[PDB]
Assembly symmetry: C3
C-alpha cells in the first residue's frame, strides 16, 4: 500500500505541476 | 492513519481531475 | 515515511487550492 500510495502521490504531484504550467500559459494568453 | 491518507489522496485526485477539465475548457475558450 | 508522505500530500493539496483560485479568476476574465 505504501509504495502504491507514494506512487499515486508522485503521479498526482506531476499532474499538478503540469496544470501549473497550463495556467501560466493561459495567463500569458489572456495577458 | 494510512486509510485517512489514502482517502485524502483519492479526494485530491478527484480535485485534480476536475481541474484538468476546467483547464481544458479554458484552453478551448482562449485558444 | 508516512510523515513525509503526509507532508507531500498537504503540499500537493495547497497547490491545488491555489490553482482552483487561478482557474476561477481566469473564468471570470474569459466568459
Ligand atoms: Zn494539459
Ligand atoms: Zn471548478
Ligand atoms: Zn497563481
Amino acid at each position: 500500500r505504501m509504495k502504491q500510495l507514494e506512487d499515486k502521490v508522485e503521479e498526482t504531484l506531476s499532474k499538478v505541476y503540469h496544470l501549473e504550467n497550463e495556467v501560466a500559459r493561459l495567463k500569458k494568453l489572456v495577458g
